[PDB]
Amino acid sequence: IVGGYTCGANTVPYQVSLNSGYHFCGGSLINSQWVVSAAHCYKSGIQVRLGEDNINVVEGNEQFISASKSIVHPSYNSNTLNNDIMLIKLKSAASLNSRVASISLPTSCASAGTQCLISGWGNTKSSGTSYPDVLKCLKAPILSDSSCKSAYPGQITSNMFCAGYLEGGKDSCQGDSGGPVVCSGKLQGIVSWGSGCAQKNKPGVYTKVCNYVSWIKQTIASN
Numbered sequence: 001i002v003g004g005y006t007c008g009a010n011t012v013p014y015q016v017s018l019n020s021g022y023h024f025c026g027g028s029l030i031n032s033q034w035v036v037s038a039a040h041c042y043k044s045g046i047q048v049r050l051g052e053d054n055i056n057v058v059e060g061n062e063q064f065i066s067a068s069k070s071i072v073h074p075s076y077n078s079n080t081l082n083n084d085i086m087l088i089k090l091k092s093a094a095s096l097n098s099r100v101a102s103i104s105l106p107t108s109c110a111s112a113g114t115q116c117l118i119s120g121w122g123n124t125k126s127s128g129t130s131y132p133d134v135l136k137c138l139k140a141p142i143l144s145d146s147s148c149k150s151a152y153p154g155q156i157t158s159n160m161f162c163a164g165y166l167e168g169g170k171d172s173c174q175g176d177s178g179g180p181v182v183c184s185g186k187l188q189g190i191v192s193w194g195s196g197c198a199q200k201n202k203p204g205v206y207t208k209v210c211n212y213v214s215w216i217k218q219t220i221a222s223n
């Protein structure tokens, strides 16, 4: 996250870190046994880490659970990143408490202008590299589809939406992928992609979660 702020130990209890010997992507806990992330974050040997603040220090509230199965969206396209969403099942149910909670799925889509909270352990510099050990947060509004498509002509689909500031300075970045975008208490987006980080006229692109609620609910119920 570039231009954001330190969230504070477990102020985002649904935020998880995907670990394959090191943090590589973010994720969102939707219930005791399931996590939602980006399909482009897929890989074998995934260990889900919950209740994390400083990902390089054991503070006492973390829960490390191995993934039993991964399900990338059936129509995920790695070239265009269309349908960039995947489900990850926990080998054993997570212990839900205060630092470890799930985030509700949307009942309907959010509109442009709506403010959301984007979080992650990704790069914090837009013209360099510096990865944080503590969870970073950023409040950003959903941008009009017109400004989104204008910024990325011929690249935006109905399964994506832009959020951030066209003036640059605040945005998600490498390391934040798969992470949450929560608007009005609902998981409306997943950190997907963008051109650079916090660059003017280049907002972050997020997977439009509201389009996948049926698939998510049906897939989880059948697995």
Ligand SMILES: *[C@](=O)([C]([C][C][C][N]C([N])=[N])[N]C(=O)[C]1[C][C][C][C]1)C1=NC2=C([C]=[C][C]=[C]2)S1
Residues within 6 Å of the ligand: 024, 025, 040, 041, 081, 122, 171, 172, 173, 174, 175, 176, 177, 178, 191, 192, 193, 194, 195, 196, 197, 198, 202, 203, 204, 205
């Ligand atoms: C993701 O954190 C990044 C997101 C950058 C967000 N940029 C904004 N908001 N301007 N995604 C990427 O680097 C790409 C998307 C598809 C291919 C590359 C990460 N996801 C992964 C990373 C490393 C390894 C695997 C997935 S960083």
Ligand SMILES: [Ca+2]
Residues within 6 Å of the ligand: 052, 053, 054, 055, 056, 057, 058, 059, 062
């Ligand atoms: Ca920790």
